Amino acid sequence: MTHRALLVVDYSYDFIADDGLLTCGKPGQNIEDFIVSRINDFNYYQDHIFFLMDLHSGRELYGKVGKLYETIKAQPNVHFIDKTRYDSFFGTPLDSLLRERSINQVEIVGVCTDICVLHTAISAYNLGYKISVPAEGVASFNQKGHEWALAHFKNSLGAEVEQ
Amino acid sequence: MTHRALLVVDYSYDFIPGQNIEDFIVSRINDFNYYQDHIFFLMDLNIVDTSGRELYGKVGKLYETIKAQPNVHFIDKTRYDSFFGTPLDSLLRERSINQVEIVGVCTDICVLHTAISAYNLGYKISVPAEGVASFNQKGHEWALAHFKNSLGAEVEQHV
Amino acid sequence: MTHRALLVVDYSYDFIADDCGKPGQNIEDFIVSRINDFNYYQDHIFFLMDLHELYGKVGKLYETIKAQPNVHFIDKTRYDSFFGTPLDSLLRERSINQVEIVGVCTDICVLHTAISAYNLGYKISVPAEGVASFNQKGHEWALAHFKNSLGAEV
Amino acid sequence: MTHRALLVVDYSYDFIADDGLLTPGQNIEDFIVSRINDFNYYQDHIFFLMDLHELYGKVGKLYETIKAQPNVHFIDKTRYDSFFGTPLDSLLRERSINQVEIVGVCTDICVLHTAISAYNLGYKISVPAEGVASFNQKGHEWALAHFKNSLGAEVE
Ligand SMILES: [Zn+2]
Ligand SMILES: [Zn+2]
Ligand SMILES: [Zn+2]
């Protein structure tokens, strides 16, 4: 699609790495390959990619995602947005940036499924975006919450959730 | 204690363990009215101008008894989140409210979305376990934990 | 690509009749013609009204169209039609990206609504014949603001 | 009970300097300095709000000495309105702020839009006539009366 954007939520060393402060360990690490391939997909079409990061070394992007970001961060289709709450839209210009660019569809990847992803997805929903949350592209430390949130995205938010 | 409002989320004929919380909700409505504290009935707009859209049961009866009072408010909403597209935030700030108690249904949908907006907007949040309910146990329990561990809410099991 | 809606701001008897919005009497006929032109295409029309009945021919036109799917009535609590209302989400639901604003007062309710529309990324049109203010200085200041700062067609 | 913050709107080189890319804002410099000093004496919070797209003169020099303090904040904004797309309202609410004083430029553009949003969000507003300026003297005068008569502001 041409009116689509990728939202990469809080994929930082502190959340993903084993020696990270508030880490998610292995599950957040198991989505690295899928996120890297979603970034390349969007970049191929010069679709817009937003890296959304909690503001507070540890706040650098994790692993291959952080590596890829270093090589594309100057491109006009790549954005880095500091956020102060879990919800990527709260107190940020994200919605206005998407609207400027005629985006009405977001794909959301990152961590955690039932916190920052969920809060971001709910705001995307209220703001009238079409939503995709691929189950291979999100993770949580809480298995019950991960499964709870994927069904919430599908059944309450009308989101495409591909297994 | 002092600067508080009650949000009664979506407690309608059409959505209503919803009947099991009826008595607790009525007592919380009476508790806030017992101090002239502000009570907001938030209702999805559930066809307009129909009987399925009325407040259910004893809660509906109590509402009819206090609806004209200046501490009682009825707000129509268009999404699950009670704050979205409504003047709820502005009405709470007019009245120097920094504390909300949230009751009604469903725990992991309208209550959750309302709680998240409350949280983002800087309100202190209490969601008593006895005053919310959901169609599914796993969502109910997930949401009560979310309220406590992520939103910093008070989620008292017993009052 | 242009997808448009008309915002009719605070065109009420209490603002307009002789019993700040009083020059709103001047614009009755032009507002009616805007509503008729949008309704010819089935474009969406929003009547925005302070929540503290529509004046004249606009009121009589409203009764013959009020039940149609393209006609909406929204209560507001501040000057800004977008504040504390579902207006932005109703526009988004319908893929609207341009709003034409008529009503009163040019430098108050129209001004606050236009700024919100601008911030939310809507293209704006405020025809000079479709807005009034008893404050002629403010009227003239506000129309220049729309054009010069909000990028509006005036 | 009043708890106040200072909003210093768009007092940059390019809006104020004779050579600035999009330039009477020079004449309010000393008054803005005194307001910043007055709020800073009490450790009241001060927010510098700047278009994204450096602070002018004595305001910039003063900022360099206080910028690391917990009561001093720098906020980038993408529209005229200081509240739009920014965490400004959340930062003010976090600190129990209920009143804002607005200074800077231009009276009838970024100050106006900032003030309208503060009004809608329920803040008590002060816009001292000596602390705001605009090229458009007609818009300056219009905007000042608007603050007093529509937004219930204190305009001293
Ligand atoms: Zn954090
Ligand atoms: Zn009003
Ligand atoms: Zn600019």
Structure tokens at A118: 């969920």
> C83 CA distance to ligand 2 centroid (A)?
11
| Distance from chain centroid for Cα B73 | 12
Residue type, C88: D
Q: What burial class does residue A64 get, using C-beta atoms within 10 Å of its C-beta: 0-12 exposed, 13-18 middle, 19+ buried?
A: middle
Structure tokens at D19: 């050579």
C-alpha distance from B24 to closest chain C C-alpha (Å): 30
CB atoms within 10 A of CB B14: 15
CB-based contacts of C61, cutoff 8 Å, min separation 6: C32, C35, C36
C-alpha distance from D86 to closest chain B C-alpha (Å): 13
Alpha carbon separation from D29 to C60, D66, D110 (Å, rounded): 55, 17, 17
Is B81 in the A-facing interface, judged by CB distances under 8 Å? Answer: yes
Widest Cα–Cα separation across chain A: 40
- Cβ pair A93:D87 closer than 8 A: no
Structure tokens at C150: 């909000």
C-alpha distance from D33 to closest chain C C-alpha (Å): 28
CA torsion sign, A59 to A65 to A66 to A70? negative
> C132 CA distance to ligand 3 centroid (A)?
29
Is C120 in the A-facing interface, judged by CB distances under 8 Å? Answer: yes
| CA R_g for chain C | 14
CB atoms within 10 A of CB A99: 18
Other chains touching C, judged by 3 or more CB pairs under 8 Å: A, B, D
What distance in Å separates the CA atoms of residue C150 and residue C142, rounded to the nearest whole number?
10
Q: Which of D2, D6, D7, D4 is nearest to D111 (CA)?
A: D7
Is B93 in the D-facing interface, judged by CB distances under 8 Å? Answer: yes
Q: Which ligand is nearest to the CA of A59?
A: 1
* Bond into D110 cis (ω within 30): no
- Cβ pair B142:A86 closer than 8 A: no
Is B82 in the C-facing interface, judged by CB distances under 8 Å? Answer: no
Q: Which residue ranges form the domains of chain A, and what is each CATH number?
A: 1-163 (3.40.50.850)
- Cβ pair C120:A100 closer than 8 A: no
- Cβ pair D81:C145 closer than 8 A: no
- Cβ pair C77:B84 closer than 8 A: no
Chain C residues within 8 A of A126 when measuring between CB atoms: 89
Is D13 in the C-facing interface, judged by CB distances under 8 Å? Answer: no
Of how many residues is chain C composed?
154
Interface test with C, best of A94, A99, A103, A126 (most C CBs within 10 A): A99
Please check whether residue A46 is in contact with residue A80, taking contact to mean a CB–CB distance below 8 angstroms: no
Give the strand pairing for B99-105 and B124-126.
parallel
Chain B residues within 8 A of D99 when measuring between CB atoms: none
Please report which residue ranges of A30-162 form alpha helices under DSSP H. Answer: 32-44, 63-72, 94-100, 118-126, 143-155
Q: Which ligand is nearest to the CA of A115?
A: 1
What distance in Å separates the CA atoms of residue C49 and residue C25, rounded to the nearest whole number?
17
Give the strand pairing for B124-126 and C71-76.
unpaired
CB atoms within 10 A of CB C7: 27
| CA R_g for chain B | 14
Method: X-ray
Structure tokens at A7: 């939202």
- Cβ pair D90:A92 closer than 8 A: no
What distance in Å separates the CA atoms of residue B58 and residue B46, rounded to the nearest whole number?
19
Other chains touching A, judged by 3 or more CB pairs under 8 Å: B, C, D
Q: Which of C124, C127, C72, C80 is nearest to C98 (CA)?
A: C124
Please check whether residue B133 is in contact with residue B140, taking contact to mean a CB–CB distance below 8 angstroms: yes
Chain A residues within 8 A of C93 when measuring between CB atoms: 128
Is B90 in the D-facing interface, judged by CB distances under 8 Å? Answer: yes
CA torsion sign, C113 to C116 to C120 to C125? positive
DSSP lists the bridge partners of residue C6 as C45, C100
Interface test with B, best of D93, D100, D120 (most B CBs within 10 A): D93
CB atoms within 10 A of CB D53: 10
Alpha carbon separation from A136 to A38, A109, A111, A144, D74 (Å, rounded): 11, 9, 11, 16, 38
Interface test with B, best of C89, C94, C116 (most B CBs within 10 A): C89
- Which member of A90, A115, A156 has the closest CB to residue B120? A90
Is A99 in the D-facing interface, judged by CB distances under 8 Å? Answer: no
C-alpha distance from D153 to closest chain C C-alpha (Å): 15
Helix axes D29-41, D57-66, angle to 10 degrees: 20
Structure tokens at C21: 């919005």
Q: Cα C116–C109–D25 angle (5° rounding)? A: 65
> D15 CA distance to ligand 2 centroid (A)?
34
> C22 CA distance to ligand 1 centroid (A)?
53
* Bond into C105 cis (ω within 30): yes
Please check whether residue B140 is in contact with residue B109, taking contact to mean a CB–CB distance below 8 angstroms: no
- Which member of A99, A126, A128 has the closest CB to residue C121? A99
Alpha carbon separation from C56 to C12, C13, C62 (Å, rounded): 9, 8, 10
> D40 CA distance to ligand 1 centroid (A)?
29
What distance in Å separates the CA atoms of residue B98 and residue B123, rounded to the nearest whole number?
5
Cited resolution, angstroms: 2.1
- Cβ pair B142:A119 closer than 8 A: no
What distance in Å separates the CA atoms of residue D89 and residue D102, rounded to the nearest whole number?
14
What distance in Å separates the CA atoms of residue C30 and residue C36, rounded to the nearest whole number?
10
- Write down the residue that tokens 């502000």 correspond to: B38
Q: Which ligand is nearest to the CA of D22?
A: 3
CB-based contacts of C110, cutoff 8 Å, min separation 6: C9, C101, C103, C104, C126, C131, C142
What distance in Å separates the CA atoms of residue D102 and residue D119, rounded to the nearest whole number?
12
DSSP secondary structure of D44-65: -EEEEEEE---B-HHHHHHHHH
Residue type, C25: Q
| Distance from chain centroid for Cα B112 | 10
C-alpha distance from A129 to closest chain C C-alpha (Å): 9
Q: With a CB-CB cutoff of 8 Å, which residues 40-69 of chain C face chain A?
A: none
CB-based contacts of A64, cutoff 8 Å, min separation 6: A32, A33, A36
Q: Cα D89–D56–D71 angle (5° rounding)? A: 40
Chain B residues within 8 A of D93 when measuring between CB atoms: 121-122
